Amino acid sequence: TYDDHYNRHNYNPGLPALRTWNGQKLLWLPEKSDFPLVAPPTNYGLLEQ
Amino acid sequence: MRECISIHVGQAGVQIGNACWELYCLEHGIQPDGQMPSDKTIGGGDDSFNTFFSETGAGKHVPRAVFVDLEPTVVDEVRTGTYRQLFHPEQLITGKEDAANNYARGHYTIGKEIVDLVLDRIRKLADLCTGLQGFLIFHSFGGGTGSGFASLLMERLSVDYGKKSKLEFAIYPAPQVSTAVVEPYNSILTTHTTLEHSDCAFMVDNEAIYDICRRNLDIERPTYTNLNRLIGQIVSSITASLRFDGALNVDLTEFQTNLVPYPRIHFPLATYAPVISAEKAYHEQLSVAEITNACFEPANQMVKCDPRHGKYMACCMLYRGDVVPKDVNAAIATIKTKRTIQFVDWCPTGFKVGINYQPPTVVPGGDLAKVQRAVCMLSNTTAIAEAWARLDHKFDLMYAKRAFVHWYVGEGMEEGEFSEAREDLAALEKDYEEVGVD
Amino acid sequence: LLYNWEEERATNQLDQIPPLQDGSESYFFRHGHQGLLTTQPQSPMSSST
Amino acid sequence: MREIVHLQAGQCGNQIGAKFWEVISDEHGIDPTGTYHGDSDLQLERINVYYNEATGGKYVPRAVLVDLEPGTMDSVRSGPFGQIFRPDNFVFGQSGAGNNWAKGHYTEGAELVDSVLDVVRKEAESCDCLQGFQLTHSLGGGTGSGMGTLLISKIREEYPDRIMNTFSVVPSPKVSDTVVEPYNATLSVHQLVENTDETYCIDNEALYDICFRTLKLTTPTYGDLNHLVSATMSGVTTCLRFPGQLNADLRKLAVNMVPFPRLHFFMPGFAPLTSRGSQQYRALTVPELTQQMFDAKNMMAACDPRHGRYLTVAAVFRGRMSMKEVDEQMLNVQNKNSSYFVEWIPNNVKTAVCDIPPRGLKMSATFIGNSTAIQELFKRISEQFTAMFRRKAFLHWYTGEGMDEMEFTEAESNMNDLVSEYQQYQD
Numbered sequence: 001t002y003d004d005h006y007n008r009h010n011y012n013p014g015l016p017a018l019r020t021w022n023g024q025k026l027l028w029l030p031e032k033s034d035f036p037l038v039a040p041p042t043n044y045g046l047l048e049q
Numbered sequence: 050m051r052e053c054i055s056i057h058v059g060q061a062g063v064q065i066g067n068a069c070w071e072l073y074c075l076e077h078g079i080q081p082d083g084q085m086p087s088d089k090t091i092g093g094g095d096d097s098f099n100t101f102f103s104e105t106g107a108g109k110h111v112p113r114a115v116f117v118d119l120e121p122t123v124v125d126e127v128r129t130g131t132y133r134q135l136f137h138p139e140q141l142i143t144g145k146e147d148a149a150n151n152y153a154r155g156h157y158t159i160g161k162e163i164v165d166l167v168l169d170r171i172r173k174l175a176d177l178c179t180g181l182q183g184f185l186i187f188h189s190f191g192g193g194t195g196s197g198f199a200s201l202l203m204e205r206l207s208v209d210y211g212k213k214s215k216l217e218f219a220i221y222p223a224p225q226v227s228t229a230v231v232e233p234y235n236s237i238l239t240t241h242t243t244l245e246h247s248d249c250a251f252m253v254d255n256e257a258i259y260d261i262c263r264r265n266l267d268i269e270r271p272t273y274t275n276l277n278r279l280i281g282q283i284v285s286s287i288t289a290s291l292r293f294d295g296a297l298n299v300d301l302t303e304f305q306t307n308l309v310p311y312p313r314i315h316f317p318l319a320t321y322a323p324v325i326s327a328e329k330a331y332h333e334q335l336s337v338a339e340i341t342n343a344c345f346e347p348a349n350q351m352v353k354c355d356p357r358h359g360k361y362m363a364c365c366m367l368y369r370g371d372v373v374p375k376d377v378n379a380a381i382a383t384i385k386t387k388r389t390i391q392f393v394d395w396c397p398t399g400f401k402v403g404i405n406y407q408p409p410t411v412v413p414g415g416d417l418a419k420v421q422r423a424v425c426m427l428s429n430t431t432a433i434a435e436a437w438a439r440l441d442h443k444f445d446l447m448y449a450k451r452a453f454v455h456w457y458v459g460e461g462m463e464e465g466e467f468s469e470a471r472e473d474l475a476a477l478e479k480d481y482e483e484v485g486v487d
Numbered sequence: 488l489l490y491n492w493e494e495e496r497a498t499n500q501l502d503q504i505p506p507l508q509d510g511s512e513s514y515f516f517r518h519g520h521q522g523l524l525t526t527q528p529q530s531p532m533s534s535s536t
Numbered sequence: 537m538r539e540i541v542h543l544q545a546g547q548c549g550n551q552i553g554a555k556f557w558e559v560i561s562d563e564h565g566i567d568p569t570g571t572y573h574g575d576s577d578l579q580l581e582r583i584n585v586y587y588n589e590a591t592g593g594k595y596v597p598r599a600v601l602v603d604l605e606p607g608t609m610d611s612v613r614s615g616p617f618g619q620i621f622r623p624d625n626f627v628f629g630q631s632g633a634g635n636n637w638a639k640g641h642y643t644e645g646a647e648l649v650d651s652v653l654d655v656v657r658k659e660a661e662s663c664d665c666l667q668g669f670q671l672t673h674s675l676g677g678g679t680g681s682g683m684g685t686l687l688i689s690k691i692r693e694e695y696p697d698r699i700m701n702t703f704s705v706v707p708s709p710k711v712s713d714t715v716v717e718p719y720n721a722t723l724s725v726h727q728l729v730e731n732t733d734e735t736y737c738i739d740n741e742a743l744y745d746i747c748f749r750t751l752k753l754t755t756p757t758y759g760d761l762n763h764l765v766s767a768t769m770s771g772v773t774t775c776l777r778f779p780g781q782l783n784a785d786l787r788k789l790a791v792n793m794v795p796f797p798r799l800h801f802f803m804p805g806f807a808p809l810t811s812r813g814s815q816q817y818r819a820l821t822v823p824e825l826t827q828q829m830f831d832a833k834n835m836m837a838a839c840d841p842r843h844g845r846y847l848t849v850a851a852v853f854r855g856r857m858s859m860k861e862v863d864e865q866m867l868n869v870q871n872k873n874s875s876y877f878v879e880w881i882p883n884n885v886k887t888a889v890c891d892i893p894p895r896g897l898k899m900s901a902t903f904i905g906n907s908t909a910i911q912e913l914f915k916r917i918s919e920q921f922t923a924m925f926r927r928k929a930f931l932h933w934y935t936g937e938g939m940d941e942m943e944f945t946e947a948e949s950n951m952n953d954l955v956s957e958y959q960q961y962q963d
């Protein structure tokens with residue numbers, strides 16, 4: 001989680017204004033319940049050395 | 050000059066300090082490497098960072114904070130983070146053993162052999178410092194390692210240094226939410242130890258912070274990053290006077306003298322007015338009037354205190370951004386004319402105003418608004434005693450059945466100190482209505 | 488025309504130093520403006536005693 | 537020749553003196569770099585009243601800036617005229633005030649009074665012969681009240697034969713911002729009445745009402761307020777620097793203004809205040825100046841003397857006027873409201889006419905007043921002092937500093953004696 005929010009600067013392929021009047025809750029919603037999962041998670045330099 | 054030292058005790062108290070420095074590095078444009086672009090700001094260490102960072106001839110901004118923790122998990126994790134090159138390694142004070150949520154264990158078992166080490170850090174930070182108005186302690190009442198270890202060190206820094214201020218910031222225990230039933234044990238233990246030494250204790254509660262998110266920010270599923278952003282914004286707002294100037298410049302010493310009315314009770318309440326979503330900022334307008342209504346609106350307080358159940362003593366409003374005295378002095382005058390806000394008759398005036406020209410800025414990847422005018426509301430009211438009133442009837446039962454005492458008496462402690470806090474507490478409520486009674 | 492119309496429209500032409508960045512009028516006019524004098528720049532040289 | 541040295545005290549006076557001195561530079565026509573653009577002989581002649589000479593035609597201001605907080609001093613130095621102020625004239629300290637009256641009166645001043653006295657006496661030896669001194673500060677200001685009271689006391693025994701002019705701004709009566717402000721004011725005013733001989737009382741709220749009235753510009757800057765007070769203080773000083781058959785000495789003014797020694801507090805009054813279209817809609821004529829000069833709305837100082845009566849009135853006119861119009865105008869107002877003066881003194885007007893118009897307008901004037909309008913002021917602070925002294929709020933600090941309710945008893949007792957005094961002479 002720290003890597004995502006702080007280091008990875010969160011999810012790139014996401015659309016920025018993915019939050020607006022929705023369906024059931026006819027308001028700003030479809031922003032984030034999915035959360036990033038992609039990209040090398042465990043690839044700092046100390047492992048290879 | 051005008052500098053201070055920030056303290057971060059407890060592994061829950063370090064990510065909040067992490068975010069603040071992350072927030073702090075933005076407004077000064079600090080690159081994660083530790084150096085500016087080719088623009089000339091490096092030297093002997095004298096610019097807007099000199100109050101926050103230590104960018105010496107070496108060229109690397111050194112934050113004037115020390116992160117202390119008892120468990121190496123998170124601290125090593127952030128030691129592998131993004132700005133770890135900025136962070137001085139051994140002021141990220143790591144630990145090899147935990148206090149097991151025990152105040153005394155962190156206060157007695159392990160705090161002794163570690164305080165001397167951090168004592169070397171503070172003095173070697175003291176020698177390089179010049180004016181060092183005071184301290185910035187980040188901690189928690191229900192601290193597994195925040196409670197006990199901070200208590201010893203604040204005793205030690207109080208006795209050796211009693212000529213400077215100490216600013217306290219801890220998450221207040223959730224009145225109805227408890228992740229630990231030992232939290233009432235250490236929390237009142239911390240309070241009774243700190244009442245005669247702490248200068249300015251500032252608290253906050255996460256539930257209403259959570260309640261804010263889906264009220265006006267309309268976030269039903271925020272995260273700590275948002276939570277840490279809000280509190281980091283709060284400390285950023287109060288520290289802008291050190292960073293920049295304004296129509297008038299205020300300081301913690303003015304805050305201390307004017308906020309705390311009488312000894313013991315030094316527990317005011319903060320608030321941030323333009324807590325609003327980005328979209329709401331777009332198609333609306335912000336001005337001093339409505340935010341002054343919002344700042345004094347009871348549901349905007351992060352502490353579950355109802356002002357009409359108490360009475361007001363002090364109100365410190367720190368206007369950061371583009372404001373004029375005209376509407377500000379008129380708006381507060383209207384507030385003085387309002388009937389519902391029941392200030393005590395003791396204080397005709399209870400308003401400490403601070404004006405700062407610098408507009409509050411947004412953070413990349415953030416969730417706040419594009420604030421032109423902001424204000425921080427440091428206020429103290431008598432509606433807070435119910436919180437301690439809540440704690441004691443929680444505490445009086447459990448102590449009467451003396452649960453978990455075998456853990457504390459097992460590690461060498463006893464009940465006499467536990468007895469002290471209850472009449473120490475009972476002293477706190479009894480004074481509260483005494484000052485509450487006109 | 489809103490409240491306080493006439494002068495606000497008229498002052499911008501006499502006040503020929505408008506800032507370009509948004510909201511910087513207070514930053515620009517932090518020192519102040521020219522209110523306590525005539526629009527003309529110079530009335531010295533009057534050897535009138 | 538007879539000169540004046542200025543003292544820039546308190547953090548408000550830091551803005552005041554900054555605005556006060558730049559107007560004078562603009563009035564006399566010196567560039568910000570300091571090379572005087574020789575334009576008027578009379579100001580060329582009479583700049584030595586306030587400015588000394590450095591090499592290169594640079595009029596050095598004979599003013600002293602004092603503070604504790606570097607940042608404010610850096611700002612004014614980075615101002616348009618910081619270069620004309622001397623680094624020598626920048627004396628300060630390494631500590632924070634806490635907006636504390638006692639710390640600046642016993643703790644921090646102790647190691648700074650030595651330095652400031654040396655600087656001023658060095659400046660005193662630099663100049664030849666002084667009328668006296670004037671001070672820009674505030675009575676409700678934390679450090680300003682602490683410093684000046686110490687300084688005015690020390691300079692009293694230093695030179696008890698000069699003019700101890702005091703220019704202090706009264707904080708807002710409705711809200712004082714600082715809660716301990718009444719303590720600071722009551723402490724300060726106790727020493728003030730003992731040490732001072734003249735006092736200007738200035739209130740921010742009235743200036744806000746003034747902006748609502750004639751400025752009509754909604755949002756001003758506090759420096760623009762500093763512009764207003766500087767213009768008034770410029771006018772009262774135009775008498776000394778400019779020729780014309782008017783007697784300018786403050787002693788000449790003070791004896792005509794002070795019937796009894798304990799009368800130190802005085803209220804200002806200024807001349808044409810003009811709105812957006814009325815510049816070209818104004819026939820600037822002595823009747824309408826006199827009418828606007830004696831307007832309760834035109835007043836700016838404390839609160840309406842309508843509540844009381846008028847002891848001494850003194851107005852200075854700056855422009856191309858004649859003795860006859862000022863004479864009849866006083867006769868006009870004398871007939872307009874005769875009973876509103878006190879029977880104790882008739883014909884209590886003191887007129888001086890400066891023949892040199894200001895740079896920007898011709899017909900102008902300044903008024904200094906001593907009327908029964910101050911009773912409400914210290915009566916107001918009386919209830920505040922008693923209410924907070926009723927249960928000793930915010931008191932552990934000063935006892936921690938080493939002060940006691942000892943000092944507060946006679947401080948208000950001295951203040952109370954003033955209440956009956958202003959009552960007794962009039963009522």
Ligand SMILES: Nc1nc2c(ncn2[C@@H]2O[C@H](COP(=O)(O)OP(=O)(O)OP(=O)(O)O)[C@@H](O)[C@H]2O)c(=O)[nH]1
Nearest residue numbers: 059060061062150189191192193194195196220228
């Ligand atoms: N200050 C702070 N508190 C948090 C955070 N997240 C959760 N909390 C709450 O704060 C409490 C932290 O107290 P402790 O668990 O005693 O922290 P500690 O003393 O450093 O020692 P540990 O028990 O190892 O965490 C938790 O019980 C949470 O309820 C956070 O990010 N910062």
Ligand SMILES: Nc1nc2c(ncn2[C@@H]2O[C@H](COP(=O)(O)OP(=O)(O)OP(=O)(O)O)[C@@H](O)[C@H]2O)c(=O)[nH]1
Nearest residue numbers: 296546547548551635674676677678679680681758
């Ligand atoms: N410089 C300045 N002062 C102001 C302004 N508005 C109000 N003031 C008041 O003017 C007072 C006088 O300043 P000082 O005498 O220098 O005060 P101090 O001793 O430095 O301590 P403080 O009163 O806390 O500032 C202050 O107390 C302010 O409350 C303003 O816009 N600029």
